[PDB]
Amino acid sequence: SMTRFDVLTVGNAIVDIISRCNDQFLIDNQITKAAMNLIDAERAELLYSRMGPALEASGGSAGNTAAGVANLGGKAAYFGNVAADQLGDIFTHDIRAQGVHYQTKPKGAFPPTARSMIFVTEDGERSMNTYLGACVELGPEDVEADVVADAKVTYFEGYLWDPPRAKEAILDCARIAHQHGREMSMTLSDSFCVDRYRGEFLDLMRSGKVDIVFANRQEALSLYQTDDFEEALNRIAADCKIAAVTMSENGAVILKGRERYYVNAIRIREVVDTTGAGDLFASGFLYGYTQGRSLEDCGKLGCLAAGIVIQQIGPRPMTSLSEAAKQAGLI
Amino acid sequence: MTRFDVLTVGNAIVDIISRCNDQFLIDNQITKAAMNLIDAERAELLYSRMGPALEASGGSAGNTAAGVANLGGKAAYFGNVAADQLGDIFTHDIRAQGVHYQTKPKGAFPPTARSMIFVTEDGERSMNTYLGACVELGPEDVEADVVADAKVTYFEGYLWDPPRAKEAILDCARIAHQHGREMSMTLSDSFCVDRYRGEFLDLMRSGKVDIVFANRQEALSLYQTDDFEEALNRIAADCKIAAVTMSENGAVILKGRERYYVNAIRIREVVDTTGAGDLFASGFLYGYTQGRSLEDCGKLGCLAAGIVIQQIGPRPMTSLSEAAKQAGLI
Numbered sequence A: 001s002m003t004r005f006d007v008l009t010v011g012n013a014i015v016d017i018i019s020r021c022n023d024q025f026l027i028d029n030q031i032t033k034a035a036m037n038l039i040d041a042e043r044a045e046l047l048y049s050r051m052g053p054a055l056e057a058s059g060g061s062a063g064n065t066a067a068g069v070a071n072l073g074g075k076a077a078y079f080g081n082v083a084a085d086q087l088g089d090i091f092t093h094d095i096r097a098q099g100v101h102y103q104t105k106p107k108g109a110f111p112p113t114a115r116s117m118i119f120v121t122e123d124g125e126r127s128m129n130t131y132l133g134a135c136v137e138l139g140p141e142d143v144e145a146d147v148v149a150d151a152k153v154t155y156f157e158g159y160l161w162d163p164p165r166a167k168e169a170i171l172d173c174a175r176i177a178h179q180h181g182r183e184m185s186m187t188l189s190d191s192f193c194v195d196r197y198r199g200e201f202l203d204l205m206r207s208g209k210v211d212i213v214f215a216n217r218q219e220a221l222s223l224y225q226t227d228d229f230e231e232a233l234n235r236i237a238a239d240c241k242i243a244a245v246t247m248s249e250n251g252a253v254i255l256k257g258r259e260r261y262y263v264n265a266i267r268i269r270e271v272v273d274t275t276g277a278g279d280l281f282a283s284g285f286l287y288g289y290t291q292g293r294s295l296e297d298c299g300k301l302g303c304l305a306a307g308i309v310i311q312q313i314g315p316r317p318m319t320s321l322s323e324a325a326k327q328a329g330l331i
Numbered sequence B: 001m002t003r004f005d006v007l008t009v010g011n012a013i014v015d016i017i018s019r020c021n022d023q024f025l026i027d028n029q030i031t032k033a034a035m036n037l038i039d040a041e042r043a044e045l046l047y048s049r050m051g052p053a054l055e056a057s058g059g060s061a062g063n064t065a066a067g068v069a070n071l072g073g074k075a076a077y078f079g080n081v082a083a084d085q086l087g088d089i090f091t092h093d094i095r096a097q098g099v100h101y102q103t104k105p106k107g108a109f110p111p112t113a114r115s116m117i118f119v120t121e122d123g124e125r126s127m128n129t130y131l132g133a134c135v136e137l138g139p140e141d142v143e144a145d146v147v148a149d150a151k152v153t154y155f156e157g158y159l160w161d162p163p164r165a166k167e168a169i170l171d172c173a174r175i176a177h178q179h180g181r182e183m184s185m186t187l188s189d190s191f192c193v194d195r196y197r198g199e200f201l202d203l204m205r206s207g208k209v210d211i212v213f214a215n216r217q218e219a220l221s222l223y224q225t226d227d228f229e230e231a232l233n234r235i236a237a238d239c240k241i242a243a244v245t246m247s248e249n250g251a252v253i254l255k256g257r258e259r260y261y262v263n264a265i266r267i268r269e270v271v272d273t274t275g276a277g278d279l280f281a282s283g284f285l286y287g288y289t290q291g292r293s294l295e296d297c298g299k300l301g302c303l304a305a306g307i308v309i310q311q312i313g314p315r316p317m318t319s320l321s322e323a324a325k326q327a328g329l330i
């Protein structure tokens, strides 16, 4: 039975730069609200010059998910490329300190470590502005084949389709994972990311390279270019073995063939910062999944972790998810 | 018209913040509630044992300048960072708050100072500081026109650790007083006071410092006494104005024989005490440079301090001017 890892995740290694803003700031700066907005180095400088005093926290969607799995008690690993700089050192420290295996080697100091300027509005929504930096170097050379072979699930970001060579690494992961009887999972990441790579994402699912897909409502609607959510659910269920579809305050639904399992969102005192919600939903789900739990219980664990992360600043819970899961009887 | 209300001078530091259990401090021989100086090797070692962290611009005087600006006052800062990413963060955050900050980095080594701050379940903070580029702060960093044009110049007792910062401070005191401005200092930390007791007393008695900030522990340390009433009597005799904080018991402001007691504000929970004294000084000095009564200066200080301890991060993320308006202090 013994496997070295429950979950390997693969993504853009990013440090977040976080500030609260008013609604007008997003309009003035033509930032798309609630989305991941890619930016070049010049725009990164410009936006930073306009940003208020900030807090820094290690981020990266898949990075956050790996950290969450480790926090819950699972065995996690991560592939993602930073630079040999202070931001890279922060990223390396934080993920390793959480007890995630992280061994991707920087290639030099330039391009520098990716950062995302995340603007949080009063409603708690987050709008991200990401300079990919050293993420553009992630490639097949960064696949630790022994780790993929020894991970129950390898999970990756749709966001990896933006940098040039990351997709080649992911295809290598899929080959190795499936040769060793493991499963592959992806998140659709962002509705505009889906707009960019819709055909390629559908191909990953239909060809069986991806077994388990994570989406939110917006991403699922985007995937099929529909405004009919019921259509989106029917189609996603036909395109992948298992789909986990989140619906913000309305909880989540897990699909497997004709099976549907609806889960409620937890009670929130107040939505502080939604950054990381989907990532931590994936942590909870994948932790449950690799512990042999029912699909419903995987959904419950996802909703618990996501509800915790949106009540704090920072994309990675600072409290014990295992303790919260125990208190909730999810164990 | 004067360009600045408050110029502060201190060690420019980025904070690296994590919550820990009580045993961690014991295992690592970290003095609880204190500023613990560390070398580069110890910084690497402690970081290797620290959990996932959050980074936020810090530096005691940096936080104070940011708080004055937040309240609506006009603030400037002198402090030295390196030409590196942490220095860029520090530079951005203080300038983004509307603080004049023009100190030029001198190189990439030593790198920008950082302090690993461990917050225990009681909200207490224990700081472990590698001074880095702070050791390079000297007289060359004094913007004489800024000192000349600031109502109050305020500095950290912490500046007595790096080698040449005290020379910059003596130059500031000269310029400030030549232009009829006032000088202020904070005693910073009780162990810092133990290190520089005689020098601090000399700054006060010689008139180089006009307004002194202390907490209870610092005041007791200054006179090596267990008697808080003795410490208050003595500190009042040694400086023109003393502002002495007493944590949950508020503060007392002393001027000659005058004493003004002020209450702590009501709080939801002590999340992280980092910055409490810094922000008390922000509120006090903001009030002081707006011509407010010493009691109202104390009340502004207690408001700002009470806000900062209810959040993670040494610099309030909320509007202090709005809070002051709501509390009817402005």
Ligand SMILES: Nc1ncnc2c1ncn2[C@@H]1O[C@H](CO)[C@@H](O)[C@H]1O
Binding pocket: A011, A012, A014, A015, A016, A036, A058, A059, A060, A061, A062, A064, A116, A128, A130, A157, A159, A160, A162, A275, A276, A277, A278, A279, A315
């Ligand atoms: N292009 C990107 N790829 C992967 N993660 C990203 C991207 N932009 C922002 N993020 C991360 O998304 C997280 C929230 O899901 C943040 O912690 C942030 O670092």
Ligand SMILES: Nc1ncnc2c1ncn2[C@@H]1O[C@H](CO)[C@@H](O)[C@H]1O
Binding pocket: A216, A246, A247, A248, A249, A251, A252, A264, A265, A266, A267, A268, A271, A274, A277, A278, A281, A302, A303, A304, A306, A307, A310
């Ligand atoms: N407003 C909200 N209230 C409760 N949970 C939420 C909210 N927004 C997001 N979530 C949680 O985050 C997940 C992904 O958005 C959801 O499935 C849900 O569990």
Ligand SMILES: Nc1ncnc2c1ncn2[C@@H]1O[C@H](CO)[C@@H](O)[C@H]1O
Binding pocket: B010, B011, B013, B014, B015, B035, B057, B058, B059, B060, B061, B063, B115, B127, B129, B156, B158, B159, B274, B275, B276, B277, B278, B314
């Ligand atoms: N040696 C030091 N000099 C000045 N400020 C410091 C020192 N060590 C820690 N600090 C700062 O003290 C602040 C809290 O008062 C923290 O934000 C931290 O950066």
Ligand SMILES: Nc1ncnc2c1ncn2[C@@H]1O[C@H](CO)[C@@H](O)[C@H]1O
Binding pocket: B215, B245, B246, B247, B248, B250, B251, B263, B264, B265, B266, B267, B270, B276, B277, B280, B301, B302, B303, B305, B306, B309
């Ligand atoms: N427990 C507390 N409750 C309210 N205010 C506090 C507390 N601890 C410290 N402070 C504030 O911070 C200042 C410096 O410690 C005090 O004068 C006080 O105003």
Ligand SMILES: [K+]
Binding pocket: A273, A274, A275, A276, A309, A310, A311, A312, A313, A314, A315, A316
């Ligand atoms: K969050």
Ligand SMILES: [K+]
Binding pocket: B272, B273, B274, B275, B308, B309, B310, B311, B312, B313, B314, B315
């Ligand atoms: K604080």
